[PDB]
Design a protein around this ligand. Structure first.
Ligand code: GDU
Ligand code: MN
Length: 242
């Protein structure tokens, strides 16, 4: 019959979370198969020694993923949906589809939280020049992206009529001592990362993909990108506070 189907690039920024990944892959694969979502998991493995930069990794994963994927899911590796009514569907013309809304997320409950699991059309992501590159270490990168969404004249949509709440919609298995949040600030990080970034994004992220690995986990194919991010210490020296 030849019908076209939407295809989701599941982008998972990643470093030192193997145990999480082993739970993530079978869970998401089963979950998405149940709702018939065609997709592939890309593990975006940061292999430079700078601080963790999930936003730049997402930009890299976006560039790498084939054009056949017409939308992406920017997805934390430790955050699993427990409710089948969370549809990972092709977002509407309105803008990004935010799965892990503040009324459903176990921890983050502010109105404009768009983190955890955020689905974006290829065209919309392109239109916004992707994510800022200036976020090294934990925090703020999704909040700046929220402003990009608005500046592009788009809106965030979230699932409606979800009956579960903050305690039973997602599993967030992330112990703050086990997997520490890198909240250090150095140089003028605080002042700079709190400012909207009109200068960097998808179009100027600097990197090399050193290696592409094809992995199977219990028969499920997953792609690993070993990504070497570059840091310009003349611009973002807080990529390394050592
Ligand atoms: O050293 C790290 C740090 C993070 N991650 C990945 O990045 C994801 C998000 O990082 P955290 O789990 O450490 O932070 P939070 O639990 O506070 O998550 C929220 O805060 C982050 C702010 O940086 C992101 O916005 C994220 O989407 C949002 O759900 C992780 O799940 C994991 O997939 C790694 O792989 N290695
Ligand atoms: Mn987490």
């Amino acid at each position: 019959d030849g019908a076209s189907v939407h295809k989701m690039a599941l982008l998972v920024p990643f470093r030192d979370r193997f145990e999480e990944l082993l739970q993530f892959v079978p869970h998401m694969t089963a979950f998405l198969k149940r709702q018939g979502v065609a997709h592939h998991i890309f593990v975006l493995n940061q292999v430079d020694r700078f601080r963790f930069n999930r936003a730049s990794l997402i930009n890299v994963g976006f560039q790498f993923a084939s054009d056949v994927y017409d939308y992406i899911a920017m997805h934390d590796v430790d955050l699993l949906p427990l409710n089948d009514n969370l549809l990972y569907e092709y977002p509407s013309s309105l803008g990004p589809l935010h799965i892990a809304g503040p009324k459903l997320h176990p921890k983050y409950h502010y109105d404009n939280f768009v983190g955890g699991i955020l689905l974006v059309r290829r065209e919309h992501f392109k239109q916004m020049n992707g994510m800022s590159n200036q976020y090294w270490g934990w925090g703020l990168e999704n909040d700046e992206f929220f402003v990009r969404i608005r500046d592009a004249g788009l809106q965030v949509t979230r699932p409606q009529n979800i009956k579960t709440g903050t305690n039973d919609t997602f599993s967030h298995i992330h112990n703050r001592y086990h997997r520490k949040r890198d909240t250090q600030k150095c140089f003028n990080q605080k002042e700079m990362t709190r400012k909207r970034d009109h200068k960097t994004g998808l179009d100027n992220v600097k990197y090399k993909i050193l290696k592409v690995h094809e992995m199977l986990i219990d028969q499920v194919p997953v792609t690993i990108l070993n990504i070497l991010l570059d840091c310009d210490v003349n611009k973002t020296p807080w990529c390394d506070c050592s």
